[PDB]
Design a protein around this ligand. Structure first.
Ligand SMILES: *[C@@H]1O[C@H](CO)[C@@H](O[C@@H]2O[C@H](CO)[C@@H](O[C@@H]3O[C@H](CO[C@H]4O[C@H](CO)[C@@H](O)[C@H](O)[C@@H]4O)[C@@H](O)[C@H](O)[C@@H]3O)[C@H](O)[C@H]2NC(C)=O)[C@H](O)[C@H]1NC(C)=O
Ligand SMILES: *[C@@H]1O[C@H](CO)[C@@H](O[C@@H]2O[C@H](CO)[C@@H](O[C@@H]3O[C@H](CO)[C@@H](O)[C@H](O)[C@@H]3O)[C@H](O)[C@H]2NC(C)=O)[C@H](O)[C@H]1NC(C)=O
Ligand SMILES: *[C@@H]1O[C@H](CO)[C@@H](O[C@@H]2O[C@H](CO)[C@@H](O[C@@H]3O[C@H](CO)[C@@H](O)[C@H](O)[C@@H]3O)[C@H](O)[C@H]2NC(C)=O)[C@H](O)[C@H]1NC(C)=O
Ligand SMILES: *[C@@H]1O[C@H](CO)[C@@H](O[C@@H]2O[C@H](CO)[C@@H](O)[C@H](O)[C@H]2NC(C)=O)[C@H](O)[C@H]1NC(C)=O
Ligand SMILES: *[C@@H]1O[C@H](CO)[C@@H](O[C@@H]2O[C@H](CO)[C@@H](O)[C@H](O)[C@H]2NC(C)=O)[C@H](O)[C@H]1NC(C)=O
Ligand SMILES: *[C@@H]1O[C@H](CO)[C@@H](O)[C@H](O)[C@H]1NC(C)=O
Ligand SMILES: *[C@@H]1O[C@H](CO)[C@@H](O)[C@H](O)[C@H]1NC(C)=O
Ligand SMILES: *[C@@H]1O[C@H](CO)[C@@H](O)[C@H](O)[C@H]1NC(C)=O
Ligand SMILES: *[C@@H]1O[C@H](CO)[C@@H](O)[C@H](O)[C@H]1NC(C)=O
Ligand SMILES: [Ca+2]
Ligand SMILES: [Ca+2]
Lengths: 340, 339
């Protein structure tokens, strides 16, 4: 063995070719809410994900406001902020359309669930991850980085600075809390990609991962969501080969982060940054995690130690330059795991 | 002399894929042309009265827009251009919703300067620009196209045709006219716009509607809103014509000159009588493939000359003939009479 690598894994559900599953939130009742980036910007609802073949249904298509959805984060219980924009095409390598990013709310405290525009954010480059402040959950932080001049045919790859916005979902007011940080930046060390990708908050520690340098970072944040001076990022862990996407603390209060990387998932010590691949490439179970994108732990007695992993690729490619989109959601049972 | 078809000549032809969309004539008489594709640019035609005049890229507006549509002069030799991001440079591509903007090209400086005047995300598709003659730092801007533009247009639900007032000094803007059948399209002429070009003469705002062949006008107050009850006056109707944009004149003459379906028309302001002067409908019927706008020369060499922009390679015989390939031409109107 219990806890041996590769950890036990199963497939919950697989979407058709062209469906890009990008992020995940777990509801208080334990069901999953998944964002998709293509073919449409939607949220899908996975019911009783601890069962063998859970039912899944479209919860809402956000076409009214966006072509694509990216990140999702819960605010007050069973309300969720999602982010997205218009995109030049549903193709996997398409850029966004500049100035079309927005934050929208999906309110599952009403049935049917209610949606609304929370904030157009034309000044952001590309909104990515969403993390509510634990003590003030109506306030969210949002990560932001991609090409500075997105166009129909991308030629100028000048990256925008990685940065993090504060959004007050009650008023729609937003402001930058952090920008101009090498730790949020990309230099395309890993090819065309982003710098800062997922963000998650635990207590008063804001964590993020960098897709281009394999760094995991954190910084202490004040009650208003701005960093505590001198606002210098603390390195948690560096695995230079890994194209980190998003992550989850836990389970429960284990001293660990669980992070999606390059066709694999890793456990990472919060104390000292020791990193161990637990499934996918680098283990004998090396075809089962093609292009994972995010992960979050279950929230019921059935699955508190189960890490639910989204992914967007049909098979493991020989090349990151010609992937094939076909999304999925899987489950990794972390019970008994130990770094060594 | 003055006979139809009026004398015409080509000043310059652009490569295939180049869509020349509108025109402003500078105080010194040179032409400033907007392009929609391949890029959003202004081209500068020097001494257009000469036989084969020189032309050059004045500014590429890529920093803010994939495409430019209309252009209108504000204070002397400053110009507002409008444009947005588009899903592709394909001739049939929709715009990307909420990316429209008005920018300024300042030709008083050397080299010409540019700035962003207003992002206008509430607008649907900005089209024609016309400054107020008594307050040229205020411009009216027409606006109509699909209500829900997308990567592959399937819902053709049209936006209401309307007109914005933009204060170029503050960047503030508000609607002054909306909810008018006369600015609307029902696609009587196929996928198109409703209100297209706008121009202002004195305190009279004119516009053409591309879908119903109508020419209209309303009186406007000094603050730029129409005089109540702001009912459009029908000026002329030619049902078959896909009007795009137009020019008053030349000089004192009681006429508008309007680009139509592969043709140009002179139109009486007093009574709306409409005479095709070049293109389809005259014996010289291939020389105006898809004209887009027109304005008169402003020098002693060409104040009776109507410079006409266009975006089509040739008059399309069938709907899959349409080849984008733009141009600028000149129609000498000297001696013309309605007859
Ligand atoms: C000029 O063209 C406009 C664009 O087509 C015309 O506007 C449309 O007019 C129709 C007929 O009245 C309206 O249809 C009704 O809409 C209501 C609901 O309206 C509200 O919700 C819609 C949907 O979000 C929204 O678009 C409206 O602004 C309202 O907030 C329905 O309950 C009726 O059953 C009926 O369908 C259209 O709603 C309206 N569209 C827009 C975008 O305004 C306009 O009538 C034309 N004017 C003239 C003089 O011909
Ligand atoms: C780097 O940090 C990790 C944690 O992120 C450290 O691993 C943890 O080490 C502790 C020992 O201090 C382990 O606790 C022991 O667990 C066993 C098994 O249940 C229990 O019987 C013992 O009484 C004790 O509690 C803990 O399991 C382990 N955590 C994980 C996730 O592996 C690691 O030691 C640190 N490395 C260095 C070099 O300090
Ligand atoms: C419809 O309206 C148009 C004007 O938009 C009329 O054409 C204009 O008719 C006037 C007659 O009052 C012409 O002006 C007169 O002719 C000459 C001008 O050199 C002069 O001898 C007179 O003193 C007076 O100015 C004007 O030239 C003419 N405009 C054009 C462009 O032809 C037209 O008669 C009206 N009706 C129809 C059926 O067209
Ligand atoms: C979904 O996409 C996958 C991957 O592109 C398709 O699998 C390929 O199918 C072709 C045959 O058309 C084979 O030549 C390739 O070797 C397959 N690739 C892999 C990795 O197996 C799959 O057929 C598509 N599914 C559907 C229903 O269209
Ligand atoms: C993070 O990335 C941004 C964007 O690449 C960097 O900002 C650029 O810095 C160079 C040199 O200092 C300037 O020439 C560019 O004009 C800047 N671009 C923008 C968009 O501001 C920034 O220096 C990086 N920060 C760190 C700490 O590495
Ligand atoms: C995606 O959204 C569009 C518009 O809302 C719709 O036509 C289509 O059926 C949706 N689903 C797809 C493409 O799977
Ligand atoms: C421009 O388009 C026309 C229309 O199809 C075509 O005949 C012509 O060859 C093109 N010009 C080129 C390819 O240089
Ligand atoms: C369009 O503009 C870009 C610069 O923004 C330039 O690289 C490209 O060559 C232009 N296209 C054409 C056809 O000139
Ligand atoms: C132009 O005129 C000629 C001569 O009558 C005719 O054959 C041709 O069809 C006309 N073309 C158009 C586009 O009207
Ligand atoms: Ca991501
Ligand atoms: Ca036009």
């Amino acid at each position: 063995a219990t806890g041996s690598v590769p950890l036990p894994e199963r497939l919950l559900h697989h979407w058709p070719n062209g469906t890009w599953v990008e992020n995940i939130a777990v509801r208080p009742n334990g069901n999953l809410l998944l964002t998709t980036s293509t073919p449409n910007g939607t949220v899908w609802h996975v019911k009783k994900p601890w069962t063998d073949t859970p039912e899944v249904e479209l919860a809402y298509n956000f076409d009214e406001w966006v072509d694509r959805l990216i990140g999702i984060g819960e605010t007050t219980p069973d309300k969720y902020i999602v982010v997205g924009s218009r995109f030049y095409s549903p193709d996997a390598y398409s850029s966004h359309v500049d100035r079309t990013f927005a934050a929208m709310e999906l309110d599952f405290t009403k049935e049917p669930p209610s949606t609304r525009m929370v904030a157009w954010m034309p000044e952001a480059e590309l909104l990515q991850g969403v993390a509510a402040l634990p003590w003030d959950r109506s306030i969210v932080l949002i990560s932001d980085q991609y090409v500075l001049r997105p166009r129909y045919k991308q030629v100028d790859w000048t990256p925008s600075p990685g940065q993090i916005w504060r959004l007050d979902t009650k008023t729609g007011d937003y402001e930058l809390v952090m920008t101009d940080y090498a730790e949020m930046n990309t230099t395309y060390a890993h090819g065309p990609d982003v710098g800062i990708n997922g963000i998650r908050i635990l207590g008063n520690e804001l964590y993020w991962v960098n897709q281009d340098n394999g760094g995991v970072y954190r910084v202490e944040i004040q009650k208003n969501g701005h960093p505590v001076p001198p606002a210098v990022p603390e390195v948690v862990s560096v695995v230079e080969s890994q194209l980190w996407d998003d992550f989850a603390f836990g389970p429960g209060d284990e001293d660990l982060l669980w992070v999606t990387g390059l066709n694999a998932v890793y456990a990472v010590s919060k104390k000292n940054g020791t990193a161990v691949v637990v499934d996918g490439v680098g283990t004998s179970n090396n075809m089962s995690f093609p292009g994972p994108t995010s992960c979050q732990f279950g929230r019921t007695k059935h699955d508190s130690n189960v890490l639910y992993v989204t992914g967007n690729l049909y098979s493991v490619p020989d090349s990151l330059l010609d992937v094939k989109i076909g999304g999925w959601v899987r489950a990794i049972d972390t019970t008994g795991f130990h770094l060594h």
